[PDB]
């Protein structure tokens, strides 16, 4: 699955390891926001779900406007697991 497919299946032993603790991340930003997240409490990711289905939106104001527009679940779903080492 070259030049096609990449992310969806391909674990990568993150290169990113932070040295302030021992923790790990594909892509720098993850290990980027991760220390001015944690080591420090001023960067604080926006989680804000929807009420009438129940959608993931990292965005006070765009979750909001969807929710207007938003009709609802249509469907059961919200249920995953991958118990595994790696
Ligand atoms: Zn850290
Ligand atoms: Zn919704």
Do not use: I
Request: hydrophobic residues 20%; aromatic residues 8%; contains cysteine.
């Amino acid at each position: 699955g070259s030049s096609g497919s990449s992310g969806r299946t391909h674990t990568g032993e993150k290169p990113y390891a932070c040295s302030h603790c021992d923790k790990t991340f594909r892509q720098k930003q993850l290990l980027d926001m991760h220390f001015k997240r944690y080591h420090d409490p001023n960067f604080v990711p926006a989680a804000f779900v929807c009420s009438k289905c129940g959608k993931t939106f990292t965005r006070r104001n765009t979750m909001a406007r969807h929710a207007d527009n938003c009709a609802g679940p249509d469907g059961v779903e919200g249920e995953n697991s991958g118990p595994s080492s790696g």
